[PDB]
C-alpha cells in the first residue's frame, strides 16, 4: 500500500510531477483555510 | 443594421463586465508582486536616475553593475506623455533596446520594440504589437521579424484574447503562427488561459496545448501580507516545479521570500535607507548544492523635491 | 531532411485550420457572457 | 563471529548514512531560518520603531 | 517582389533604417525631453547623474 | 658570577626599554587593523556564538557559510583561563583544527596546534611553538612536523627574535631550517625585520634574504580615522604591489576601504544593527576584469546580559 | 584622395581607442565613488544622528 | 631508532594519538567548560546556539 | 628624457616594481605631510 | 636527480653556518641597545 505511494512519489518517471502537484494542493489549502493568515500575518 | 447592434450592445453592457487586462498579466500578482523571480540578481548593482519632469515624464538613468550576465554599464532615457511613451537603453557593448508606445485611440495602442545588437554579433528583432482594449475584452496581435521579401509571409505572429465571462471570471486564448523559413512548413501553437479574481484571492491557469500547465494562486493575508503559489508542469521527460512565496509590506521596507520544490530558497529585501536611496539585498540558496548567490544593489533618484510641483502625466502607455 | 513540396501543403493546411479554429474560439468567448448570464437567469 | 561483524557492517554503514541525512537536514533548517528570519526580524523590528513614533502622537 | 533587384533595395532600406535607429534613437528621446520638459534643464544637467 | 650580572642587568633596565611583541605582529596595525585582507569573503556567512562564562572564558560557536572555499558548517568551542587557552573547531568534512596554549611562566608560554584532515585526504600538521617574552625582547622557536624516526632531524624549524633598541625602535631576526627529506639537503632562509613605533605613526619592514621586501606605514588621522600603506616586492620575474587603505571608527560601525596598484578596490562595512547582532558587508572589485565579489555575513552573541556580572579572565593566552 | 582616407583610418582607429579608454576611466571612477561613498555616507550619516541625541542632553 | 621494529611502534603511537585528538579534543574542551564554567549551564543549553 | 621615465614605468622587466615603489612614496608623503588628515578626517 | 653523499655534506655545512650566524646576529642585537645608548651619550 504505502509502497505504491512512495514509489510513485520518488522513484517513477512521473514522480517529479506528483511532488509539485502535491505541494500546490497543500500550499493552497494552507492559504485558503486561514491557517496561513493566523501564522504569517 | 444598428437595430440589432443597439439591442446587442445594450444587453452586452447590462452584465456589468469590465476589461480583464492583458493575457501576460494573468499571473502578475503571483509571478511579479509576490515571487522574487524578477528581482533576483548577483553581484553589485547601482542605478542613478535623474528625473527632469513629471508631465511630460522625462528621466535619465545610469546603471553600473558587476555580476553574472550583468552588463558593466547601461544608459537609459525615457519620455512619456498621455498619448505616448518612448524608452531607450544601450549597453556598453552597443546593445540597444528601444520601446515606442503610442495611443492611436484611448482603446487602441501600438507598441513597437527594437533590439539592435552589434552588426556582426547576434540577431536583430523587430516587434510590432497592436493592443485593443474593449469594454470587456482585450485583443492583441504581435508580429516579430515579419518578412515578405522571399515571396511569402515569414516570422512569428502571436494572437491574444482575454474575455470577461462574469464580473469575476475571465477566460482567454493564445495562438501562435511561425514560419521562419519558407522552405520549412509553418508551425502553430495554441494556449488557453483563464483567471478567477475576487477581492481577497486570485486563481489563474495557462494550459499549453503541447502539455505544459501553469497554475497560480494569490491571496492577501491581511493589510501588509500577501502570498502566492506558482505551479509549472512540463511534459515535453516530465518535469514539474512548485514555488510558494510571501511578500511583507512594511512602512520603510518590503520583504519577499520563496521556496520551491527544487529546494531553492531565495529572499529579497528592499529598504528605504534614505529619502532618495533605496537598498536592495537579494540572496538565492540552492539546498541540494549548498551554493548561494548574493546580490547587493542601490537605487538613487536625484530629482527629489524640485519637481514635486508637477504631477505625473495620466495613463502614460508604459 | 527538407520537406517535399506536397508535405508543405499538408503543413500549411493544418496550420491554417488551427488558426481558423482559434478565431472560432474567440468568437465563442465573445458570445460566452451572454450564455453564462442566461444560466444564472434560469437558477 | 562473522555474523556479528556483518551486523556491525550493516549498522556502521546505515548509521553513517543516517547521521549524514540528519546532519544535512539540520543545516538546511538552520540556514533557512537564518536567511529568512534575519532580514525579516530587522525589517519588522524597524517597523515597530516607526509605529512607536506614531503612537506617541 | 516584382523585381529581384527591388528585393535587394528593400534589403538596403532595412540596413539604412537599422543604422538610423541605432545611432539616432537615444538622441531623439533626449531631444524630445530637453526641448519639451517643463522646466528646461541645463545642457550639462540634462545628462548629469545626480547634480 | 652575579657581580657582573648585577651591573649588567641594572644597566640594561636603565635604558627604559619595553617588550616589542611578536615578530608576526610587526605589521598588525596596517595589515590587520586597517587593511581588509583578513576580512574579505564572498557568499553568505552566519556565526552563532553562545558564551557560557567569562572567567574562565568558555563559549561555543556555530558557523554556517555558503561561498567560495567556505566550509558549509564549522563547530567551534574554546576554553580560556589566566594560564591556559584551549580552542577547537571542526568542519562538516571532519577537518579538525586545534589550539592549546599554556603559560608555564608569566614570561614563557607554549603554543601547540594540530590540523587533522580526514585520514586518506590531505596531510596532518603538528606545530609546537615556544614563546619567551623578556623585559625588552621576545624569542620564539617553532617546530612543524618534527621527526627523528629516519635517524635524523626532519621538519620545519623557525627561530624568531625581536629586540627593543630604543624606546621607539625595535629590530629583529627570523631564521628557518628545513629538511623534509633526509635524502634532500637542508634548506635555510633568514629574514630581517624592524619597526619604528611612535604615538601617531608606525613604520615596519621585513626583508627576506632571498630578495622580497615588505614595508608598511601606519598613521592615525585623528580620533576616529587611521590609514596605512603596505608595499610588497617579490623578485623570485619581478613583482610588486602596494596597498593603501583607511579605517573609520564610528559609534555603531567601522568602515574599511583599500585600493592597490593591481587595480583592486575593496571595502568592508561592519555595523551593529542590534545589541547582539553585527552585520558585515564586504565587496571586492577588480577594475581590470570588472568583476565583483560580494560577501554578506552576520554574527550573533547569545550570552548577552546574563553573564555580564563576571568579568573576563586576565591575559588569557589567546 | 587616398591620403585623406589614410588620415580617416588613422583618426577613426585612434578616436575609437581614445573613447574606449575615456569611457573605461569614467566607469572606474564612478564605480569607486559608489562602492566607497555609499557605505561611508550611510555609516557617517547614522553617526550624526547618534551625535544629535548626545547634543540634546 | 635502535630497532627498526621500534620505529614502527612509534609510528603506531602517532596514529593512536592522532585518533584520540581527532575524536576526543572537542569533547575535552566541552567537558572543561561544562564542569568548570561559572555558573553551570544545562546539558542542552551547553550546545544550544542562542537559547 | 620623458621616454626614459615612461619606458621604465610601463614597458620594462622591472616596471611593476617601480609603480609600487612610487605609489608607496606618494602614499606615505600624503599621510605624513598632513594632507590626508585635512581631507579624510 | 638526487644529491650525492658528498653534496649533502656541503649542503648541511652551509645550512649550519647560516644558523650559527643567525644566533650570532641575535647576540649582537641583544647587546645592541648598550651601543646605541652609548652613541646618544656622546651627542
Ligand atoms: C545627444 C546624445 C548624447 C548622449 C546619448 C548617448 C549615446 C547615444 C547613442 C550612442 C550611439 C550608438 C553607439 C554604437 O553605434 O555602438 C556601436 C559600438 C559597437 O562596438 P564595436 O566597434 O565592437 O562594433 C562595430 C560596429 N560599428 C561599426 C557600428 C561600431 O558600440 C560602441 O561604440 C560602444 C559604446 C556604445 C554606447 C555606450 C554607452 C552610451 C554612451 C555613454 C554615456 C552617454 C552619456 C553619459 C555621459
Ligand atoms: C519601421 C520599421 C523599420 C525597419 C527595420 C527595423 C529596424 C531594424 C531591426 O532591428 O530589425 C531589422 C531586422 C531585419 O532583418 P531580417 O528580417 O533580415 O532577419 C532578422 C535579423 N537578422 C538578419 C540579423 C537575422 O528586423 C526585421 O525582421 C524587420 C521587420 C520589419 C521590416 C519591414 C516592416 C514590415 C513589412 C511587412 C509587414 C507585414 C505585412
Ligand atoms: C542536531 C544534531 C544532528 C546531527 C548533527 C551532526 C551529525 C552528523 C554530521 C555529519 O556527519 O555531517 C554530515 C553533514 C553533511 O555532510 P555530507 O552529507 O556532505 O557528508 C558528510 C557525512 N559523512 C562524511 C559521514 C558521510 O554535515 C553537516 O552539515 C553537519 C551537521 C550540522 C549542521 C547543523 C547543526 C548545527 C546547528 C544546530 C544546533
Ligand atoms: C521557514 C520559514 C520561516 C523560518 C524563519 C523563522 C521565523 C523567525 C522570525 C521571527 C518572528 C518574529 O520576530 O516575530 C514577528 C511577529 C511576532 O510578534 P506578533 O505580532 O506575533 O506578537 C508580538 C506581540 N507584540 C505586537 C506586542 C510585539 O510575528 C509576525 O509578525 C508574524 C510573522 C511570523 C514570521 C514569518 C517569517 C517570514 C515568512 C516569510 C515567508 C513565509 C512563507 C514563504 C516560504 C518561504 C520561507 C522558507
Ligand atoms: C561531547 C561532544 C558532543 C559535541 C561535540 C561535537 C563532535 C565532537 C568531535 C567529532 C568527532 C570527529 C568526527 C570524525 O572523526 O570525522 C571523521 C569524518 C570524516 O568523514 P569520512 O567518513 O569521509 O572519513 C572516513 C574516516 N573515518 C573512518 C575516521 C570516519 O567526519 C565526519 O564524520 C563528518 C562530521 C564530523 C563533525 C561534524 C560537525 C561536528 C558535530 C556536529 C555539531 C556538534 C554539536 C551541534 C549540535
Ligand atoms: C603530543 C604529540 C602527539 C603525537 C602526534 C600529533 C598528532 C597527530 C598529527 O596531527 O600529526 C601527526 C603527524 C605525523 O605524521 P608524519 O610526521 O609521519 O608526516 C606528516 C603527516 N603525513 C604523514 C600525513 C604526511 O604530525 C607530525 O609530524 C607529528 C610530530 C610530533 C610527533 C612526535 C613529537 C616530537 C618528537 C621529536 C621532537 C624533536 C626532538
Ligand atoms: C563621460 C563621457 C566620456 C566617455 C563615455 C562614453 C564614450 C565611450 C564609451 C564606449 O565606447 O564604451 C567603452 C567603455 C568600455 O568598453 P570596452 O573598452 O570594453 O570596449 C568598448 C569600446 N569599443 C567597442 C568602442 C571598442 O564602455 C563603458 O563603460 C561606457 C562609458 C560610460 C561609463 C561611465 C560614464 C557614465 C557616468 C558618468 C556620467
Ligand atoms: C485537483 C487538485 C487537487 C488539490 C486541489 O486542486 C488541485 O483541490 C482543491 C480542493 C480545495 C479545497 C476545497 C474546499 C476548501 C474549503 C474552503 O473553505 C473553508 C472555509 C475557510 C474560511 O475561508 C476556513 O474555514 C477552504 C479551502 C478548501 C480546503 C480548499 C483548499 C484548496 C483545495 C485543496 C484545492 C487544491 C489546490
Ligand atoms: C481554462 C481553465 C478553466 C478553469 C480556470 O482557468 C483555466 O478558470 C477559472 C474557473 C474557476 C472556478 C469558477 C468558479 C468558482 C466558484 C467560486 O465560488 C466561491 C464562492 C463564490 C460563490 O460561487 C462567492 O460568492 C469558488 C472557485 C471556483 C470553483 C473557481 C476556481 C478557480 C477556477 C477553476 C479557474 C481556473 C483557473
Ligand atoms: C534558531 C536559529 C538561530 C536563531 C534564529 O533562528 C535560527 O531565531 C531568530 C530570532 C532572531 C532575533 C529576534 C529579534 C531580534 C530583535 C531585533 O530588533 C532589536 C532592536 C534592538 C534595538 O537596539 C533592541 O530593541 C534585532 C534582531 C533580533 C535580535 C533577531 C536576530 C536574529 C534571530 C536570532 C533569528 C535567528 C535566525
Ligand atoms: C632592518 C631595517 C632597518 C630600518 C628599519 O627597519 C628595517 O628600522 C627602522 C629605522 C627607522 C628610522 C630610525 C629613526 C628615525 C628618526 C625619526 O625621527 C623623527 C623625529 C624624532 C627625533 O628623531 C622625534 O623626536 C624619523 C624616522 C627615522 C628615520 C626612522 C624611519 C623608519 C626606519 C627607517 C625603520 C625601518 C623600517
Ligand atoms: C626600508 C623600507 C623603505 C620604506 C621606509 O622604511 C622601510 O623608509 C622609511 C622612510 C620613513 C620616513 C622618514 C621620515 C619621516 C619624517 C617624520 O616626521 C617627523 C619630522 C622630522 C623629519 O621630517 C623633523 O621634525 C614622519 C615619518 C617619516 C615620513 C618616515 C615615515 C616612514 C618612512 C616612509 C619609512 C618607510 C616605511
Ligand atoms: C558622482 C557619483 C554619484 C553620486 C555619489 O558619488 C558618485 O556622490 C555621493 C553623495 C552621496 C549622498 C550624500 C549624502 C547622503 C545623506 C545620507 O543620510 C541622509 C539621511 C536622511 C534621513 O532621512 C536625511 O537626513 C543618505 C545617503 C546620501 C543621500 C548619499 C547617497 C550616496 C551619494 C549620492 C554618493 C554617490 C556615490
Ligand atoms: C627611499 C624611497 C623614496 C621615497 C621615500 O621612501 C622610500 O622617501 C622618504 C622621504 C620622505 C619625506 C621626507 C620628509 C618629509 C617631511 C615631513 O615633515 C613635514 C612636516 C609635516 C607636519 O608633520 C607637514 O608640515 C613630512 C613627510 C616628508 C615629506 C616625508 C614623507 C615620506 C617620504 C617621501 C618617504 C618616502 C616613502
Numbering used by the authors:
A (entry chain G), I (entry chain H): 16 to 56
B (entry chain A), F (entry chain B): 21 to 256, 265, 267 to 347
C (entry chain E), J (entry chain F): 8 to 50
D (entry chain C), G (entry chain D): 62 to 118
E (entry chain I), H (entry chain J): 21 to 71
Give the exact sentences the study uses for this entry.
The translocase of the outer mitochondrial membrane (TOM) is the entry gate for the majority of proteins imported into mitochondria as precursor proteins, or preproteins. In humans and fungi, the TOM core complex is a membrane-embedded dimer of twofold symmetry, consisting of two copies each of the β-barrel Tom40 pore, the α-helical Tom22 receptor, and the small α-helical structural subunits Tom5, Tom6, and Tom7 (3). Two other preprotein receptors, Tom20 and Tom70, are loosely bound to the TOM core, forming the TOM holo complex. We determined TOM core and holo structures with and without the bound MTS of rat aldehyde dehydrogenase (pALDH), revealing numerous interaction sites with the Tom20 receptor and the Tom40 translocation pore.
In the preparation without pALDH, iterative rounds of particle sorting produced reconstructions of both the TOM core and holo complex at 3.2 and 3.8 Å resolution, respectively. Visual comparison of the corresponding maps from both preparations revealed no differences, indicating that incubation of the isolated complex with pALDH does not induce major conformational changes. For this reason, and due to their significantly higher resolution, we focus primarily on the pALDH-bound TOM complexes, noting that any interpretation of the structures may equally apply to the complexes without bound preprotein. As expected, the TOM core complex conforms to the same composition and architecture as previous structures from other species.
